[PDB]
Symmetry: C7
Subunit: 265 residues, 7 copies
């Protein structure tokens, strides 16, 4: 499991730590330029207004190119989703395949202690391969949780890949106070080309989540092709190669890996 | 239980984490526009006044359409209720059906070890189906706690569904200081069309709670129709299908899932 | 105990969590309107003065109707009392009836294992009903701690019920600085009709504590009338129905709930 | 011990929680009225000066009536003392009588298991009343720690009782900056009738500590008069009634409280 | 040990809690009076300068009487030392006498179980008084750690006793900015008679540490004179009275304190 | 393992603690010089703008020499990577070689207890050197995780070595507000030669990470040359010297290191 | 070990607590004197500039005497190093001598239980002194970690000893804004003789670390001269005196320290 669970534990934890590293250096999020201390609380009001009138005006006030993109106000808010959607199919395996594979773990531990007392009497296990010869289409439910994550990883390497072509000059947006003008239509300056503060490290942290998950998307497929390279097809390996690894994974003893020493000597 | 308790544990925890994610980015809640630094503490007083004169004036000062809606000042305050009302029927099951099903768990574990020593002597359990043949109308009390949650989930997908048709322009409300005018009737500007800061992420977080619970409301009903598809009606299954799952849920051994291996070989 | 202790544990914890939810959104408590930045520290002094001259002036400066009500400055301060006064008779039961009922729990566990070895020899308990036939007026001390809570719950549904008829316009109070005038009698504006900030959510959170405890006051009485409906009066049930529940509450075995299976088959 | 240790554990913890509840709502402590923003840091300096020139000027600058009372700057500072002075004689009992009463607890547990094996042989304890017949004047050291607390409780109901007659108008004190005048004797306004902010809740929290400890001072004496009402005087009960309770307090068994069942049947 | 370790554990913990109680109410430490808002950052600079030019100017700028006293800037800083210097000789006992007295504790526990099996055979210990008859001058190393603390306690009751005669008017000190004048020699006002904020509670908390340690200095000597009153001198008691207490301190049994019951009956 | 794991545990923890020590003294990060209080919120806006227009302008506004270096805004952000890239090959060893070496640890513990019972019978192990004589090319996978870290350590001593030649005057950068000018092209001063605050301790903390890792890069190679100095080449030692250390590393007994005592006597 | 490990545990912990005590009272670190509120953000910029232009200007702007001393900006930053460099040779002992001395601890515990069963049979150990008679030059590696710390302690008493002769007037430094002048060469005042705030307690806390480590440097050497005073030289004691202490250090029994009682009687 380590070849899969190492990734499935470390990399969502990598993403939540990489979100929390940006959460260290928040401070504020936008800094609006009020007309050079014509007030102080009107400055905070303009800041709040433009921080909430990012998305509701669907007309052309930003004009930097395809402004319906919500000005990426949501990278912790999206990154938490993209962490938990990778975290969850491990929980689905743990809540749909873990007790059955735990009973099968007891079965294969009974197989190895039956091998041990067979060697004791030598100083039946051959029927257990018949117990794992059968149809057993339920193991493909277990392999789905790996391949379901690989869909979300693939679109993660697409969604962040949109962000770099996006972020040329998708920060310096103009913002009006138009209902604020519609208070009076009288005195307030009409628009304030404010600036988001986080676009500099939203970009150069979306390098790291992208290029790591680029360096990992073929790696999960490599676990799924050892079933192709081990003498039987993917519709036959389900009780062998998901069992051949786990037999040596949990526990062995003084006869398991001393078979081949005694097989060679 | 995992097909139900997975949802019943994760999804209220999902909702409290999704409330705490908004609790990260609070800052302030309203930003009132005082007349361009004619004071600083009058600005904070106008902010406080309008943040508490949201609901008490039942007259038409907002006029954006059906202003008796309390301007949704309560989404953590409502979301905590909608989390605990889903959390509580699990506690009602745990405080009304858990010791009786624990004694029944000891009974079915005695059934499986009686099967085990029956196989030992083969190297009485048939009366236990008569023990679960009887009337036992108390198991419908256990199935009520699932279906009680599905009522609250259904109205959760209605209450949030009101919010999106609500939130067209139900933020930019005018607010007067009228008792504040009734201090003097003299000098203060008469109304301040302030703006709530949280309407931008109250909307686009009520997507996520809605569409997930939309994607889950038929799923709980699927657990309640396996009783329809298993040879006896819902007024007969109560001691079979709430027992057929739990027999394999808690613990098995070297004879339970090796029955069918020995039944086939 | 679960039919009582579920309420007695959850609902004071409900009230302390419901107080802490208001403790999340404190910020400040009053916002006094100083004369439009004629100072900044005089504004904070007027705020502090009026926040402490709420109650000490017993004369008519508020005039909104029966101003000796302390302007409800104490809802966490009162709600903590109304939580601990419901928490404490469980502690009084635990410090006056728990070791005696623990010894009686050992006695009834001896009764059930005597039933078990009686069935073993069948493959004296009849004297124990004589041990619980006697006068035993001390069990009414145990039933007092339930009914003492129901007094405090009843006045809780009265005290909060005063608050809604109270809170029509019992916020906008006028406040003078009269000893502050008696510093000089010269220059300071004479009164400031300030405004408490918490009256909007003190009201609509006293809905929830009221209507839940309205939905719970008859429920505790239902536990006290099963003694009426079980063949003997309230001055006879004390060693039967406080013992009939606890025999099945703590632990049973393979003979207790298999009596009726063997009684029917 | 529960009739004493319940009070001795809960009520000092009550007082430290009741101090921490005021520690929640500190904010600031005094708010001095500088001359209407003639500075900002001179305002904080006047605030600090008057907050430290409360007590050092023993002359008549407050004139509200017997101003040597330190203007009660110390209610957490005094309340911590009045909590730990009630907490400490339990520690004195635990460090002067607990190992000896633990050995006596082993002795009386040997007495009850000797009763148990006496009933086993029936299917010497009479000498142990001679072991507790003797002079044993050291048990009066144990009863002193109860009565030492009752002295501190009695003066606690006197010291707080001074505070309510004190606090008529012992807040609005005049404060000069006289060494501050003695800097220059030139320009600063000569006195500032500042105001402590905490006098409103120092009063109406000294209700609760008073009236609870009023409701508890006769209750501790009731434990000391059961020795008067149990057939022997206070200079004879010391090895009976401090032992009659503890025999049933720690542990009993299937023969102790089944004596009277077998004594009656 | 309780007659010593009760003090040695509680009273340094008393002093660190009594320092932390002042650490609750820090706020700031000095408040310098800049010339009535002639700046704001010059006010903070004057505050910082005078808070660091307390001690470095050894000339007469304070003139309140013997100004080389560092204006007591160090009461948490000194009180931590006076707590740890009392804490440390317990650690010196624990690191120089605890394993040897633990082996002696095993020896005296062997003495009492040898007494127990001597009573069993009655139904050699007399040589052990010869084992503790010898010279053993190393026990005076153990008694030094008590008397070393009593030196530090005695000077603690002297050092705080200096502070009350000190603190008449050793707060209102004049402070110049002379190198600050030596920037320009031009415009800044030449001296600022600032005021430390903590002198009011540094005084009336040095009551409590003084009068408690006054009430404790003869008490430690009382433990050292029970060796004088127990039939042998201080150069003979070292293996008797440091052993007579510990024999009953750790553990006894059904024969130790039932000796005198059987000795009397 | 201690000769490697001591470094591999302490030194990434050294780097994260050395990053957190700079995280103690953050305060702010840049301090832009607005035109001498021509506003306050324009000052914060200029600060935010220049803190995010560090990298996006790739033209010559800094001109201090090769300004595409991102002005080292990322030393915690880079140092976390350089800590976890050294932390991770220990995890790769733990997830790829730890269970196999744990089974081999059980094998060599069986070898030493076989030696022990061989000495018991003296009052087969010679075949185990044949079990570790074989080809076993998988141990070179274990030695890769040491040498993979030494690549990252080597470039760490290069990347920090760039920083000292970098940081001559790569702090005082000019920053314009050009889109801010492109708001109006009217009134705002055109550029602000701001200054990063952290360049003084980014330099003199990159001493410590450099010179320690300079003092450690040859040390890891010394572990890899004991295989050269122990009678067999690196393609033969893999089952001897990775086993000769671990035999004495985990546990020995009364015969292992008493071999040579009995071999010499 | 207590004579060494007491120091090696307490005194680096003393230094980290003594650094954290200064970390309590940080506030700010420098307070620059801008020209008397000619701005507010220019004041913070001058403060930041001079706090980072301490060290980079190597020319004569401070002129207080040998200004290349970095104005001691690093006392927590240096004190952490001087704590961990004393902490680390205990870890080097624990990772280079602790398992070997643990096996030797098992060997000497086997020696004492062999003495115990030798006394049992009396109701071979003489060969073990031959086992510790041999060459064993590896124990000098263990004594190096004590003497390596004594080098760092000695230079600690030199480095702090530089600081007191340093700190006469090495605080009041002049600071220009010269690149800040090189923005304009026009209007800003040219230099600001600012002042570090921490020089007053950096001095009088470097008393305590100095004079304690002065009082400890000969004490570690005293442990290294008991090998000189115990009948064999330093090149012979290595298996006796590092073993004579540890035999009584860990555990003894009823025969070890009762040897001399039975040797004398």
């Amino acid at each position: 499991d380590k070849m899969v669970t190492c990734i499935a534990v470390g990399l969502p934890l990598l993403l939540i730590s990489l979100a929390f590293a940006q959460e260290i250096s928040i401070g504020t999020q936008i800094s609006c330029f009020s007309p050079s201390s014509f007030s102080w609380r009107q400055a905070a009001f303009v800041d709040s207004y433009c921080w909430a009138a990012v998305q509701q005006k669907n007309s052309l006030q930003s004009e930097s190119g395809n402004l319906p993109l919500w000005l990426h106000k949501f990278f912790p808010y999206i990154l938490l989703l993209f962490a938990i959607l990778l975290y969850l199919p491990p929980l689905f395996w743990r809540f749909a395949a873990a007790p059955h594979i735990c009973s099968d773990l007891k079965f294969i531990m009974e197989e190895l202690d039956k091998v041990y007392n067979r060697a004791i009497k030598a100083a039946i296990v051959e029927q257990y391969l018949k117990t794992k010869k059968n149809s057993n289409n339920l193991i493909i439910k277990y392999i789905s949780c790996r391949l379901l994550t690989l869909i979300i990883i693939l679109l993660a390497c697409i969604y962040l890949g949109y962000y770099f072509s996006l972020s040329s000059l998708s920060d310096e947006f103009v913002c009006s106070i138009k209902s604020g003008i519609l208070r009076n239509d009288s005195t307030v300056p009409d628009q304030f080309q404010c600036k988001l503060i986080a676009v500099g490290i939203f970009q150069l942290l979306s390098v790291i989540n992208l290029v790591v998950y680029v360096l990992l998307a073929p790696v999960v497929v490599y676990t799924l092709f050892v079933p192709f390279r081990q003498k039987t097809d993917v519709l036959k390996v389900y009780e062998i190669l998901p069992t051949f690894d786990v037999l040596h994974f949990k526990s062995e003893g003084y006869n398991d890996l001393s078979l081949y020493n005694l097989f060679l000597e």
